[PDB]
Structure formats: C-alpha cells, structure tokens
Design an enzyme around this catalytic site. Structure first.
Site, mmCIF file in Angstrom:
data_model
loop_
_atom_site.group_PDB
_atom_site.id
_atom_site.type_symbol
_atom_site.label_atom_id
_atom_site.label_comp_id
_atom_site.label_asym_id
_atom_site.label_seq_id
_atom_site.Cartn_x
_atom_site.Cartn_y
_atom_site.Cartn_z
ATOM 1 N N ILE A 13 0.801 -1.226 0.000
ATOM 2 C CA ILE A 13 0.000 0.000 0.000
ATOM 3 C C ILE A 13 0.847 1.297 0.000
ATOM 4 C CG2 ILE A 13 -2.170 -1.089 0.825
ATOM 5 C CD1 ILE A 13 -1.552 -0.369 3.688
ATOM 6 N N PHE A 18 11.725 5.002 4.937
ATOM 7 C CA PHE A 18 12.055 3.880 5.808
ATOM 8 C C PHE A 18 10.912 2.855 5.750
ATOM 9 C CE2 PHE A 18 13.688 7.885 7.661
ATOM 10 C CZ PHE A 18 15.043 7.665 7.545
ATOM 11 N N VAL A 21 4.916 -0.291 3.387
ATOM 12 C CA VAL A 21 3.728 -0.744 4.139
ATOM 13 C C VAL A 21 2.857 -1.691 3.283
ATOM 14 C CG1 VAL A 21 1.724 -0.174 5.578
ATOM 15 C CG2 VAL A 21 3.755 1.292 5.684
ATOM 16 N N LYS A 34 4.662 -3.111 8.214
ATOM 17 C CA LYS A 34 5.734 -2.266 7.657
ATOM 18 C C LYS A 34 6.995 -3.157 7.583
ATOM 19 C CE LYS A 34 6.251 2.284 8.651
ATOM 20 N NZ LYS A 34 6.622 3.404 9.573
ATOM 21 N N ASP A 135 7.991 14.557 13.390
ATOM 22 C CA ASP A 135 7.644 14.470 11.972
ATOM 23 C C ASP A 135 6.132 14.428 11.802
ATOM 24 O OD1 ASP A 135 8.010 14.326 9.215
ATOM 25 O OD2 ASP A 135 8.253 12.122 9.251
HETATM 26 N N1 LIG Z 1 4.193 3.447 11.754
HETATM 27 C C1 LIG Z 1 3.523 2.459 11.013
HETATM 28 C C2 LIG Z 1 3.799 1.107 11.224
HETATM 29 C C3 LIG Z 1 3.112 0.121 10.516
HETATM 30 C C4 LIG Z 1 2.143 0.484 9.588
HETATM 31 C C5 LIG Z 1 1.846 1.840 9.390
HETATM 32 N N2 LIG Z 1 0.893 2.240 8.448
HETATM 33 C C6 LIG Z 1 -0.449 1.922 8.514
HETATM 34 N N3 LIG Z 1 -1.030 1.386 9.606
HETATM 35 C C7 LIG Z 1 -2.322 1.114 9.613
HETATM 36 N N4 LIG Z 1 -3.125 1.325 8.582
HETATM 37 C C8 LIG Z 1 -2.643 1.855 7.469
HETATM 38 C C9 LIG Z 1 -1.263 2.197 7.396
HETATM 39 C C10 LIG Z 1 -0.780 2.830 6.153
HETATM 40 O O1 LIG Z 1 0.372 3.191 5.996
HETATM 41 C C11 LIG Z 1 -1.724 3.065 5.125
HETATM 42 C C12 LIG Z 1 -3.005 2.705 5.288
HETATM 43 N N5 LIG Z 1 -3.462 2.117 6.416
HETATM 44 C C13 LIG Z 1 2.554 2.825 10.078
#
Ligand SMILES: Nc1cccc(Nc2ncnc3c2C(=O)CC=N3)c1
Length: 303
Positions: A13, A18, A21, A34, A135
C-alpha cells in the site's frame, strides 16, 4: 517468528523513506505490516522501541501489535505489525473528501488528544516518558472507520528522561518533513538539549495539519480545494532554504480566510492555528490546552 509465519501479505500500500507498508491478513483480520530490509535494521529497531513504550496505547495513537522477522529462504525481512485503517492517511482522506463541521472537529480533537498523550509524562512503576514526534504531518496521521485520527509513524520520535532533563537519543541533527518544520528548526536556533522545544515544534506542525482539515470543511456547500501548507509559496519537495526564506525571513504562514470568522467552529479552529504558529515556541498552545478547547467545542456541537 510465530506471528509473521501466520500472516499473508495481500497488497503493497505504500513505499516510504524507511520501509514499505503492506495490507496483510492475521488470524482472519486485516493488519498493516511495515517491512524493512536487513540493511534498515537500525530504523526498524528504533520504531519497534518507540512503539513498545510503556503505557503508550491510546485510541489516538496507532495500535502496535508486534515486531517480527520473516525469512523467505533467500533474504530476511524485518516486520512491524500494526492495526490496519482502511481510509489510510488524513492526507489521502482530505484529498478524497470534504468534511462536515462535526467531521472537522472529530479529526482535529482526536489528533490533539493523540498528541497530548504522546507529550504527557506519567510518573510511576509503569511510567510513560514524554515523547515528541518530530515528523507530524497529514501523511503521518491515519483516519479510523469512526472518523477519528490516530498518530502513526513514530520512528523519528524522541523520549524524555525527566529526572535528568535528557533525551534518550541526544539528537544533534534536524530530521522530519521540511514543509512542516518549525521556524526554530528551519533556522537551527532550537536548543536540541531542551525537550520542551521538541514538544513546541510538534504543536507548530499540528497547526499546519489543522489548516489542512479546515480548508476541507464544507458549510453551505462552501470549501477550499485540498492543499498542503505553503502550497502558494514553495515548490513540491521544498528545501530547508526555501522553507526558511518563507517561514523565518518573510515570516508568512498559511492564509486564514476571513470567512472562517462567520462560523464558530472555524473561528475556534482559526484561533488555534494562529496560536500554534507563533515564531516563539514558548508562546504556543500546549496539546492538552488544544484538546480542552476542542472538547468544549465538540460538547457544544453535540458530536
Ligand atoms: N508506523 C507504522 C507502522 C506500521 C504500519 C503503518 N501504516 C499503517 N497502519 C495502519 N493502517 C494503514 C497504514 C498505512 O500506511 C496506510 C493505510 N493504512 C505505520
């Protein structure tokens, strides 16, 4: 490990500086994963570290599930598994939709509540250190199914050790998104030994996020097109020098339309933005104060 082996990746997505995702499925539930390569271990470990901070969990901070490793038989992937939010970022959400006055308040109040919780120190056996994001931007805030936000992308955060007034990683360099950098970060006058200075710089960035939301508030069919802050003054991917010339030298801020004074909710939002945007960090509102102001507005509106 035991979690990554039971997760099926369904779709990439997003690709950031860094990690990448992915939307995955864990025990029949959607999760966000991630993934970092072996050479990005420092970034992966630091983010896992911040997300495991004692007492961090809050409805307005991204729900962390686990750190893990997965070997596909050729290379190792470093994983961070979290809750999945279908709307994705507030940036995506504001580009796709307009919001009601209620919708605007819900997004702003939840962002401020999440930031007030990050910033708050809790003293005790299961104490929580104060945390500064470094950030904060609309691309780092996610929107939940219920129309409220949760702050994400905590990998650049710093944590305070209150008894000695010291920062866990002793930052000696500027980090974060140039567009959202506070004036004291842009001109390098910030005292990077002073934790309160990092909280104040986060408030300035939250002010810019509130301006992004308010433009998309639709009243009697009236609203602005989506724009990043300073869209009218700097190029896409601006440099530190470009931002500094505008924010520090010419001392400009995003435009507040006079028509935000004809609506109570927008008036309160405009006043908050101006009080987040002072060049003097010490004059800025705290996240708790913003939370209190918007909580009062939410009550008055009947959300
Ligand atoms: N810091 C971090 C660590 C792991 C995943 C994320 N990103 C997300 N987490 C939950 N839902 C999402 C996302 C997205 O990036 C995009 C859409 N939905 C950020």
């Amino acid at each position: 490990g035991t979690i990554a082996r039971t997760i099926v990746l369904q779709e990439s997505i997003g690709k950031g500086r860094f990690g990448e995702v992915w939307r995955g499925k864990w025990r029949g539930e959607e999760v966000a994963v991630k993934i970092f390569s072996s050479r990005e271990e420092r970034s992966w470990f630091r983010e896992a570290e911040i997300y495991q901070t004692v007492m961090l969990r809050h409805e307005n901070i991204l729900g962390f599930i686990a750190a893990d490793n997965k070997d596909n038989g050729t290379w190792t992937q470093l994983w961070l598994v979290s809750d999945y939010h279908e709307h994705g970022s507030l940036f995506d959400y504001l580009n796709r939709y307009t919001v009601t006055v209620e919708g605007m308040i819900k997004l702003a109040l939840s962002t401020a509540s999440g930031l007030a919780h990050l910033h708050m120190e809790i003293v005790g056996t299961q104490g929580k250190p104060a945390i500064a994001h470094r950030d904060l931007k609309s691309k780092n805030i996610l929107v939940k199914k219920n129309g409220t936000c949760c702050i994400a992308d905590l990998g650049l955060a710093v944590r305070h050790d209150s008894a000695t007034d010291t920062i866990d990683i002793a930052p000696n360099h500027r980090v974060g998104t140039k567009r959202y950098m506070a004036p004291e970060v842009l001109d390098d006058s910030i005292n990077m030994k002073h934790f309160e200075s990092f909280k104040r710089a986060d408030i300035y960035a939250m002010g810019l996020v509130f301006w992004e939301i308010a433009r998309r508030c639709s009243i009697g069919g009236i609203h602005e097109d989506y724009q990043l802050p300073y869209y009218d003054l700097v190029p896409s991917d601006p440099s530190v020098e470009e931002m500094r010339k505008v924010v520090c030298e010419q001392k400009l801020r995003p435009n507040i339309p006079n028509r935000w004074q004809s609506c109570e909710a927008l008036r309160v939002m405009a006043k908050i933005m101006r009080e987040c945007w002072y060049a003097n960090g010490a004059a800025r509102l705290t996240a708790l104060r913003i939370k209190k102001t918007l909580s009062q507005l939410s009550q008055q509106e009947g959300i």
